[PDB]
Symmetry: C2
Subunit: 255 residues, 2 copies
């Protein structure tokens, strides 16, 4: 449902509505959710980033939120980089459930700076991170993960951001004609297989893709058997449709 | 090439050019070939039926033939029933390589008779047969095949007609069966020939190519199509899914605001 397939459509809408907009307000209505008010092309927009452990998502929204009386440390740091920031890009990492929002801004001595707002919706852990661009260090993160010897990464202010691991499954949106052709000619295209072969397909999406493939084949199947007669010579033979009338065709072929 | 699929097309032409015509002349220019001159819609027509082991076909033609000096026994029996006959129907059997031409005529005392002229295009076993419509006995047959220990049928005058040893007609198969086949079966050229009746190898390569090509095109479209936010029974989709619920939304924000509105209090 909120799979990579869906997020792809979300991100396209997000980019067109928001790129070159200005972050005007930053708030934290719930512990692990972040709401930005953004002015873009003389219209205002409200952007929800939710690290909710069941309902994690990112979306524009019409909901009004009750904001807390005082900003947490997390929001205070974020405002220091995002208040008045220009949105420069909104990108999905491949067809995984990760959105990266790159911004630019000035600091308090007038220098132009860049930061990246990242929302991670993973299997086990969801999170929202602000990361310095030039250094790649986390500036703040909505769920802190303390330092631990030999762990994969530390999610703390000051630590280097390390991206989540990827899988070997392929991005369906960008796969080249040649590799796709090979996958489609040789694999059984069941929903389950499609989830293994391709990145970011939910079970519903995968079920729908399997169905679409079969019903489009059905459509192609009917059209081939219902098309009008169009007599044609092939290389070694002849055909009633392309691969004056069929009798003139056969007269010519047998000479 | 001259498979059931091809024959499906030409038999429609033969029907509309010939039905209710009159057979005016009957000759056997080659041993396994029969040519009928047929008058129909005030025009004359030349129908070729060929039991040749390679070239067997049924066809209208603009070619001319050198008739033999005397009609064979085969031809005189066909003339006895077909000279002046009216062409009542021209029918392919299913999608197989068999055509049946029903005719009616008078006999020499003015009594009405009926017969069926049948061509089977079966390679080495191709044959042309005239069968009496009431008795269902072969009146005559262009390649006699006698009885043996292993013969499936006796192809001789007086024998009762038996169709050739007969998969699925691709023109008429129902949606439900066809979907299952396309969801689960291997759509190679050869498995299509085994699943469906009347598919030559070139036809089946083309069909195989079509389904392959359509699969790729559907895949590309699914991942490169306009956003159309909809709910589903238990969830939501960015384009409509098969188990859609309600009507679409203007954008994904409205869809998700609505989905999540009362999820938590």
């Amino acid at each position: 449902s909120f799979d990579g397939f869906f997020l792809h459509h979300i991100v396209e809408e997000l980019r067109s509505e928001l790129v070159n907009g200005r972050i005007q307000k930053i708030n934290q209505p719930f512990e692990q959710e972040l709401v930005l008010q953004i002015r873009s092309n003389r219209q205002s927009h409200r952007l929800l980033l939710s690290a909710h452990p069941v309902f994690g998502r990112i979306q524009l929204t019409q909901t009004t939120f009750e904001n807390p009386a005082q900003p947490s440390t997390f929001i205070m740091v974020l405002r220091k980089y995002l208040q008045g920031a220009l949105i420069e890009s909104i990108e999905q990492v491949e067809n995984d459930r990760i959105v990266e929002i790159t911004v630019s801004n000035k600091n308090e001595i007038g220098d132009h700076i860049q930061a990246t707002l990242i929302i991670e919706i993973m299997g086990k852990h969801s999170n929202i991170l602000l990361v310095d661009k030039s250094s790649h260090k986390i500036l703040e993160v909505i769920k802190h993960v303390g330092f631990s010897q030999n762990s994969y990464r530390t999610l703390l202010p000051g630590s280097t951001y390390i991206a989540p691991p990827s899988t070997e499954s392929l991005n369906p949106f960008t796969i080249k004609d040649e590799k796709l052709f090979e996958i489609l000619q040789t694999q059984e295209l069941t929903a389950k297989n499609l989830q293994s072969l391709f990145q970011g397909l939910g079970r519903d999406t995968a079920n729908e893709l399997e169905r679409i493939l079969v019903s489009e084949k059905l459509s192609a199947f009917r059209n081939f058997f219902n098309q009008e007669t169009k007599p044609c010579l092939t290389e070694t033979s002849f055909s009633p449709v392309p691969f004056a009338n069929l009798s003139d065709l056969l007269d010519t072929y047998y000479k």
